[PDB]
Specification:
Detoxification, transferase, Fhb7, Deoxynivalenol, monomer, alpha+beta, 13 helices, Glutaredoxin
Length: 273
């Protein structure tokens, strides 16, 4: 009678079928993989706040210097811990339940994606803190993947669920906030969308190199899943929920079908309990 409480973002009813926030999906995949009992509290919030909690920039390494929590949040009665931030949640789960579920979320592996892309901050660090060894490669991958998908999030904006009673009003505030004239701008249509789609496909191409290397299965380590697969997998769950049907089908099929097969392989961990 003490399961983990998992705070997730309520979308449109039925909340279990419409959930689309990428960071909560990452943690949900990790929780299901670890087979640790949890229950979901579905947080209701107005448009704009919900968009902000869903995507939208973190305040700007170690939680011992962060006074804040982003969603998802877990309360674990077993240790009376309260943890925000998907990455800290995955780390906590593996530290606290190392032998439970499907195995180890964080085995040693090479995550050579976007190496050197952060050169400006390596020369000029915003903090000499954290970089918790053993996890440093996974934390860097999480940061880089998040930045790469966030650079393409305009493709998913049309599909971000809005309350039909406030939708028109919130649409009219986002435009204005931006110096724009239409919701068609922002939402992205026509040539700007075509160019973003091509960029997105190129971005997934670089990411796909890592999932190609061990071709014996869809995960980075072949048939063995890790948290790094779930970092990407959470964004795929958001894409599935928010891209137009035709565009999700194209993206599933780019690069010989790599991300389609990864998405399908994560189905076993994707139960919305």
């Amino acid at each position: 009678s003490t399961p983990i409480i998992f705070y997730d973002i309520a979308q449109r009813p039925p909340v279990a079928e419409t959930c689309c926030a990428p960071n909560p999906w990452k943690s949900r995949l990790a929780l299901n993989f670890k087979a640790v009992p949890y229950t979901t509290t579905w947080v209701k919030l107005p448009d704009i706040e919900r968009v902000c909690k869903e995507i939208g920039a973190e305040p700007s390494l170690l939680k011992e210097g962060k006074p804040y929590y982003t969603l998802p949040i877990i309360h674990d009665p077993a240790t009376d811990s309260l943890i925000g931030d998907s990455f800290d949640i995955a780390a906590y789960l593996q530290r606290t339940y190392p032998a439970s579920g499907a195995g180890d979320l964080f085995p040693p592996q090479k995550l050579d994606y976007a190496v050197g892309r952060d050169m400006q901050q390596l020369l000029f660090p915003l903090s000499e803190i954290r970089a918790s060894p053993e996890l440093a490669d996974y934390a860097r991958f999480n940061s880089n993947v998040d930045a790469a998908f966030t650079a393409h999030v305009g493709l998913m904006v049309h599909g971000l669920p809005l309350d039909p009673a406030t939708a028109e009003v919130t649409k009219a505030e986002f435009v204005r906030r931006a110096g724009l004239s239409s919701w068609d701008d922002l939402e992205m249509v026509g040539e700007a969308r075509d160019k973003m789609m091509q960029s997105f496909r190129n971005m997934l191409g670089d990411l796909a190199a890592l999932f190609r290397k061990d071709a014996s299965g869809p995960f980075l380590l072949g048939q063995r899943a890790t948290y790094a697969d779930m970092i990407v997998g959470g964004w795929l769950r958001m894409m599935r929920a928010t891209l137009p049907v035709s565009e999700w089908q194209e993206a599933r099929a780019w690069h010989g079908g790599i991300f389609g097969r990864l998405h399908d392989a994560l189905d076993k961990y994707a139960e919305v309990k």
